[PDB]
Amino acid sequence: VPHITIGKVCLESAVELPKILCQEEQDAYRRIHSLTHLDSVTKIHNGSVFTKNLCSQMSAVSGPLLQWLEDRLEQNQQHLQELQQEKEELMEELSSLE
Amino acid sequence: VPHITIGKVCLESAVELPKILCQEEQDAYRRIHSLTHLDSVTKIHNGSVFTKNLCSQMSAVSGPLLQWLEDRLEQNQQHLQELQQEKEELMEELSSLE
Numbered sequence: 211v212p213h214i215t216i217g218k219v220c221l222e223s224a225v226e227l228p229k230i231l232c233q234e235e236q237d238a239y240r241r242i243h244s245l246t247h248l249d250s251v252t253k254i255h256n257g258s259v260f261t262k263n264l265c266s267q268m269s270a271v272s273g274p275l276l277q278w279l280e281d282r283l284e285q286n287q288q289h290l291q292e293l294q295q296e297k298e299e300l301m302e303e304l305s306s307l308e
Numbered sequence: 309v310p311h312i313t314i315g316k317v318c319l320e321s322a323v324e325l326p327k328i329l330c331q332e333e334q335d336a337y338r339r340i341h342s343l344t345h346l347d348s349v350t351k352i353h354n355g356s357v358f359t360k361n362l363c364s365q366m367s368a369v370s371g372p373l374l375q376w377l378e379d380r381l382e383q384n385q386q387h388l389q390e391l392q393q394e395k396e397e398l399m400e401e402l403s404s405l406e
Contacts, residue, residue: 251371255363258356265353273349 228272235263314380326370333361 239260243253337358 249367251363251367255360255367258360258363262353262356262360265349265356268349269347269353 225275228267228275231267231271232264235260235267322373326365326373329365329369330362333358333365 239256242256337354340354
């Protein structure tokens with residue numbers, strides 16, 4: 211079914227992806243940190259891994275998602291301007307007839 | 309050829325391996341930074357990779373090598389004590405005999 215515009219529910223659901231990925235990484239890391247009986251150098255290694263993982267998440271997901279939302283705001287601004295122009299044109303065409 | 313004990317030359321050669329591995333990683337990182345015009349999150353990711361690589365190098369090479377050298381020092385102390393005991397025993401055996 212063509213839903214001409216994006217619903218608030220679907221935007222609030224689509225922005226959940228980076229949050230859920232970050233929560234997945236955090237839960238994996240918490241399960242890693244749960245084993246208290248652990249080397250310090252291993253913890254530094256795991257910290258480096260966690261940093262690179264979230265850097266990948268931001269480079270591949272959050273960044274492009276935010277860029278798409280900015281581009282869509284530009285598209286929406288242009289479309290609103292054109293539709294306001296068309297509304298004024300139709301209002302002028304119909305109003306003077308009476 | 310059975311070389312009963314360690315020459316200093318071989319220790320000075322064995323300690324060059326961690327240096328060469330660290331230098332290899334460092335040269336990789338330096339050649340990575342040549343295209344300075346690069347994303348910042350990507351540079352954080354590459355820094356994390358460098359840190360994880362050196363953490364692995366220390367966990368798998370430098371650490372076990374240092375443990376081996378400490379174990380060898382303990383072995384040499386025990387062996388020195390045993391050989392001193394044996395030297396005293398042979399000194400007594402040759403003094404009392406003829």
